[PDB]
Amino acid sequence: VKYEDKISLYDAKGNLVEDGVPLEAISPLYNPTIKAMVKNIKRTVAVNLAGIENSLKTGAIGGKGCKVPGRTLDLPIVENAEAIMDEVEKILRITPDDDTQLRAINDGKQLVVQVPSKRLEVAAEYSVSMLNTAMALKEAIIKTFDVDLFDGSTIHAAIVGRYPQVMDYMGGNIASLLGAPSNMEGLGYALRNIMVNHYVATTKKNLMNAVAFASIMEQTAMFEMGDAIGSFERMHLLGLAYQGLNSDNLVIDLVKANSKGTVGTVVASVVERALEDKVIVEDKSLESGFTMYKPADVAKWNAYAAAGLVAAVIVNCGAARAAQNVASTILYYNDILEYETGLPGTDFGRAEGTAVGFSFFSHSIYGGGGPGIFTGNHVVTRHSKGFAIPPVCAAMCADAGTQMFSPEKTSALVGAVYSAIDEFREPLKYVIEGALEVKDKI
């Protein structure tokens, strides 16, 4: 153990699991569940068999509004899903008992393809899963229906889209939770390029699990980026524990105390709790009697402010049952917190800053869109180092149907496929199980 910090693990229902767990038991570098989540996110591909069948039949290949006359094929792909699935598995499988796994969902209309992890082990990055699945599908379809050699390029276009002319799967029928590396806004950003709506749809809109999934992936990305290194590591670990994994039941405790409250009353509860836990101390009173506060532990105060931010979003977006309020909530929770105490806000002003650009780009003509289309990789919402995206996921779970670009519109395919994996659907439960498994080994 590099740190002596201890945490109490609490479930999504606010029940105590275990006291005195070492902080590093939830680290992406030690937790076996987090290791499995990265391995599975890299090798799992969503296949739309119904989509491939429709594209071929209509000749709607190459992207939005495209149709190529005379290049149509009428193949009963969905009806032959089992035969296609078995040929894809035979092509991908290395050893008879390896982790290659294929599953048909929604009566063979969609497929869950889990490429053997050995193929990712001998690869530089993660595109291999999409590229290998596409090749296995092309061969399986051509063999099943004895497709003429002059029609093979049409099969390719229905599966991957306008690749290689476009360095992306433009108009394709295969999808991943991870965006193509060609779309990264910075080095080491791949785990940040996951849409808010994808997190929400994968967790079946369960609030605490959507928060946990987003915090796990964002904080794991901080290690990949080099942000959670050396003197900065503890800040990101405490951030994950308190904001993302309900440590010491801090998130749920603040929500319960403010069930009929406001963003302001949540701020008051945060300051009260930080003083109780000796995370902050009084500094000095000024002329009017206003008392400035100081952290007793810089990184721990940051984590407490981050947990209060999630609680503020739950209270305010929950009272409105509307996700649009999230940008304003993130901004003013941090703004009120700073002028109530003289303490720095969540992520030293970067959460407030992200919320400023996020408010503007979710209420103007210049760009952005609704809260659900943002990612940790996006030009507008990348600025906070893992502390802004988890609250946005909570807001989308509280939304009763006020959004056009909802998870039902943007993430039906990825949602259905990735929700079949236990660690993705209920991350909080399985990360807690992982921490208890490794707690005495570190």
Binding site: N206, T262, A299, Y339, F348, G349, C397, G401
Partner: protein
């Protein structure tokens, strides 16, 4: 029990800011603007007309069990699935009794389920249409938070907060949604906030005197209370700046102990 302090500062401007944030501070009622008149100035619907819905009521919908999500009580308009509408004000820099960030912080301390936006020339609040009407009437228009001459309701063509006042002490409005009535000495809305002509003009009362405005304003001005005179507020601003700087450099106790 933690006693909130709301805002720093040793001048009357800082006290006026504290009073606005404080949910226990009762704002002075100055006028009585009828519900029906206010709905007409807002220009989203006519009074008596059934509220338009964005989604069905929450009771009808069969949502999966979520303990944390259902801990929070939804506002009446969210329960009934009412659409989200707005109210937008431009606040004159010449001693208006409410100002942009002052409003947003006050709204977030006092009200539930608020979406608020602060800009130099406009301050907007987006909320469930029915809940927005009750708040706008009892807090935003009837109290000392509103001055009919120096605060203007406007959804588009907002220009005016930074402009010189007219002969009667009224803020500029390119669309002239409100006018000064010489006979009564009252401000009257002749158009809605988006600029549509009203069938019946709405009287919003007489403008507040300059001496009252100077006493209750939340803006610092060299010709009023200069910010230079609030050393306490400047101390807290500089402290937040330094704490942010050091945390960004290295978020460790030793750095804060030596340089804060």
């Amino acid at each position: 029990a933690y006693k909130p302090q709301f805002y720093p500062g040793a001048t009357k401007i800082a006290q006026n800011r504290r009073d606005h944030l404080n949910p226990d501070f009762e704002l002075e009622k100055l006028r009585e603007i009828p519900d029906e008149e206010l709905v007409k100035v807002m220009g989203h619907r006519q009074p008596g007309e059934d509220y338009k819905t964005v989604h069905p009521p929450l009771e009808e919908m069969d949502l999966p069990e979520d303990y944390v999500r259902d801990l929070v009580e939804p506002i009446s308009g969210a329960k009934e699935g009412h659409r989200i509408r707005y109210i937008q004000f431009a606040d004159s820099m010449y001693f208006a009794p409410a100002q942009p960030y002052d409003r947003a912080r006050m709204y977030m301390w006092r009200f539930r389920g608020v979406d608020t936006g602060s800009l130099s020339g406009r301050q907007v609040i987006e909320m469930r249409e029915s809940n927005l009407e009750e708040i706008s009437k009892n807090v935003l228009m009837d109290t000392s938070l509103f001055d009919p001459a120096r605060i203007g309701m406007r959804g588009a063509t907002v220009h005016g907060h930074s402009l010189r006042l007219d002969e009667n002490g009224l803020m500029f409005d390119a669309l002239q949604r409100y006018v000064y009535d010489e006979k009564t000495g009252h401000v009257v809305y002749v158009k809605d906030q988006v600029g549509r002509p009203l069938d019946e003009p709405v009287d919003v009362g007489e403008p507040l005197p300059e001496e009252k405005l100077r006493e209750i304003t939340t803006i610092y001005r060299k010709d009023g209370v200069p910010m230079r005179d609030d050393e306490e507020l400047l101390t807290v601003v500089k402290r937040i700046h330094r704490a942010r700087t050091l945390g960004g450099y290295m978020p460790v106790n030793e750095v804060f102990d030596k340089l804060l």
